[PDB]
């Protein structure tokens with residue numbers, strides 16, 4: 001997250017870190033057994049880390065649970081990033097408490113202009129590299145579809161939305177991928193892609209979760 005703020009420990013209780021020996025992507029806990037992330041975060045050998053603030057210090061509220069199954073969306077296209085969504089099943093159920101909690105799936109798609117909360121442990125610099133140890137947060141509005149399509153001509157599908165600031169300076173970044181975009185208390189986006197971080201006229205692009213609720217619910221009911 002570039003241009004954000006320190007969230008505060010366990011104030012984003014649905015945020016997870018995906019670990020393969022090191023943090024590599026975020027995700028969101030949607031019930032006691034299942035995490036949503038980005039398909040482009042797929043790896044074999046994922047451990048899900050819940051209850052984290054500092055990812056390099058064991059602080060006492062963590063739960064570390066290995067994945068038993070990953071399911072990339074059937075229509076994921078890694079070239080275009082269309083359908084950039086993946087479900088991860090935990091080997092055992094998480095213990096839900098005030099520091100580890102699920103986020104609800106949406107009923108309706110969020111509206112342009114709504115302020116959302118984006119969070120992660122990704123790079124904090126627009127130019128250069130600095131990775132934080134504690135969770136960072138950013139408030140950013142959903143942009144109009146016409147603004148989004150003008151920023152990325154020929155590249156925006158109906159399964160994507162843009163959020164952020166056309167003037168630059170505040171954005172998600174590398175290492176935030178797969179993490180949550182929460183608007184009005186519901187999971188509306190997944191950190192997906194963009195052109196760099198916090199550059200002018202190049203806002204972040206997010207997977208539009210409201211288009212996938214049927215697939216999520218069917219998949220959970222069968223696995």
Ligand SMILES: NCc1ccccc1
Pocket residue numbers: 171172173174175176177191192193194195196197198203204205
């Ligand atoms: N600035 C959007 C973004 C997010 C994740 C990875 C790359 C770019």
Ligand SMILES: [Ca+2]
Pocket residue numbers: 052053054055056057058059062
């Ligand atoms: Ca920790």
